[PDB]
Amino acid sequence: FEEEDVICDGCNGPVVGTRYKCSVCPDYDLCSVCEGKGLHRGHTKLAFP
Ligand SMILES: [Zn+2]
Ligand SMILES: [Zn+2]
């Protein structure tokens, strides 16, 4: 079966916990650490569990 893996665009680490996905870009996500450092805040994001 096919598996979806989310990798953080800031640090290339796996997104464990909350996923901050850009609503503008295709396929841009941040982990909570990179989100907390303020990456990519020129675009609205969705934060899902
Ligand atoms: Zn990260
Ligand atoms: Zn974006």
Alpha-carbon distances, residue 49 vs 3, 10, 20 (angstroms): 18, 19, 9
Long-range contacts of 37-46 (CB under 8 A, 24+ apart): 37/10, 39/9, 39/10, 40/9, 40/10, 45/20, 45/21, 46/20, 46/21
Resolution for this experimental structure (Å): 2.0
**Which residues are part of a known binding site for Zn(2+)?**
8, 11, 22, 25, 31, 34, 40, 43
CB 32 within 8 A of CB 45: no
CB 3 within 8 A of CB 23: no
Residue 35 Cα to ligand 1 midpoint, Å, equals 7
In the structure encoding, which two tokens stand for residue 23, read together?
A: 């609503």
Domain range for residue 19?
Answer: 1-49
Residue with tokens 């805040």: 41
What is the 8-class DSSP label of residue 38? T
Residue 22 Cα to ligand 2 midpoint, Å, equals 5
Tell me which ligand sits closest to the C-alpha of residue 40.
2
Count of domains for the chain: 1
Sign of the dihedral defined by the CA atoms of residues 15, 49, 37, 41, in that order: positive
- Experimental technique, in short, is X-ray
